[PDB]
């Protein structure tokens, strides 16, 4: 979003966007992703629009900051491929994380232990959170999600166009989304490049 070219397209994103592999999603396409592509290979994959990607990503940041008081929004997966990323996003953001194992009824069943009252739902992927996405359609709380050319896209209100298969691309996405959201919050006045590097959000079998 925005009319500030500094938040908008800069080399500061591409120098890492091309490094990860952010310009390739997957072989096939569902009929709700055509908005976010410009070219096609001769090789069987679709190369997404990273500009539209940053566009709706900044809209995602807008949604995340319209959280007037952060204590009340869930960032969720149940797959370890983004479990680390959601943990380390929530730890630094303040909104609560759920990852690995979910329990239907936490924010749907009226009577429940860990009866949590979110106010926005963040999911790593619709193919990754079947039941929580349905429950987000059940209770009036908006939904933000990554979106591949392959992926089913149902009930998605805020779309982030990128491949969500890979630790490298998804780690770039979390690691730059954190900076973008805090940027539009204003704690980051373009003073520094952020010292955390994308290897931090490429999932690890922890032996360190």
């Amino acid at each position: 979003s925005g009319a500030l070219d500094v938040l908008q397209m800069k080399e500061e994103d591409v120098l890492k966007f091309l490094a990860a592999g952010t310009h390739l999603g997957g072989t096939n396409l569902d009929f709700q992703m055509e908005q976010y592509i410009y070219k096609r290979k001769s090789d069987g994959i679709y190369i997404i629009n990273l500009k539209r990607t940053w566009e709706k990503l900044l809209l995602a940041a807008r949604a995340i900051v319209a959280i007037e008081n952060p204590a009340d929004v869930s960032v969720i997966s149940s797959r370890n491929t983004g479990q680390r990323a959601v943990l380390k996003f929530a730890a630094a953001t303040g909104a609560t994380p759920i990852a690995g194992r979910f329990t239907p009824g936490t924010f749907t069943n009226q009577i429940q232990t860990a009866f949590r009252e979110p106010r926005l739902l963040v999911v790593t992927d619709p193919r990754a959170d079947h039941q929580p996405l349905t429950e987000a359609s059940y209770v009036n709380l908006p939904t933000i999600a990554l979106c591949n050319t392959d992926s089913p896209l149902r009930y998605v209100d805020i779309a982030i166009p990128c491949n969500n298969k890979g630790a490298h691309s998804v780690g770039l996405m979390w690691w730059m989304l954190a900076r973008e959201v805090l940027r539009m919050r204003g704690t980051i006045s373009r003073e520094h490049p952020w010292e955390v590097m994308p290897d931090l959000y490429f999932y690890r079998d922890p032996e360190e």
Binding site: E68, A71, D72, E117, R119, Y138, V139, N140
Partner: protein
């Protein structure tokens, strides 16, 4: 004595919200009864419709459980239904009471064609469906009373719908889905789009957003 649990009902006790409007703008899942048992304190006029037992057949004395229809109204525009299945007639009655207390649905009212006075009926010609019963509702002016079977008669007067023509394309002898259909018809008055409509609302920010002050507490 009594305590809220869910955030919205806890606010409603925390009365900073005064009307069901700050809810039925958003169509909120109001997952606890006592919200509208705060909104009202008395005058909750009821009627215990009926008891239908339903049983499963086994090798032994087959197992039967009873369903009790009851309805709530205020002769003004508030109306609702409570349907509960229980071991006993007593528990069925109480479950119908609670479900009918939570199931309240206010209605968009109007006239038979007049533009003065106090609204008394559906705005226009509508129809409500479920089961096999399609009940077509038609308004009716002053002096025209209630034109129904007992079920639409009640569930319109108790809906504050005073004068009315009912029509049925299906079997009213099927009271259950008859009641559900004749309540869906009342429920859908906001579906039509009129020149009295067709604007853009002012987005009176969520009870949550405006009143976060208590919302971050637990």
């Amino acid at each position: 004595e009594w305590m809220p649990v869910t955030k919205l009902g806890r606010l409603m006790k925390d009365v900073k919200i005064k009307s069901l409007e700050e809810i039925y703008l958003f169509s909120l899942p109001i997952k606890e009864s006592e919200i509208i048992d705060f909104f009202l304190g008395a005058s909750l006029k009821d009627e215990v419709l009926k008891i239908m037992p339903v049983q499963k057949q086994t090798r032994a004395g087959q197992r039967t459980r009873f369903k009790a229809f009851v309805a709530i109204g205020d002769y003004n525009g508030h109306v609702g239904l409570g349907v509960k299945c229980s071991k006993e007639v007593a528990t069925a009655i109480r479950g119908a009471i609670i479900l009918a207390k939570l199931s309240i649905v206010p209605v968009r009212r109007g006239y038979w064609g007049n533009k003065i006075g106090k609204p008394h009926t559906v705005p226009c010609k509508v129809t409500g469906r479920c089961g096999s019963v399609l009940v077509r509702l038609i308004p009716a002016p002053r002096g025209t009373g209630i034109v129904s079977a007992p079920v639409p008669k009640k569930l319109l007067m108790m809906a504050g719908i005073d004068d009315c023509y009912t029509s049925a394309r299906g079997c009213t002898a099927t009271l259950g889905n008859f009641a559900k259909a004749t309540f869906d018809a009342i429920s859908k008055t906001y579906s039509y789009l009129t020149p009295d409509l067709w604007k853009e609302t002012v987005f009176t920010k969520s009870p949550y957003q405006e009143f976060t002050d208590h919302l971050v507490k637990t």
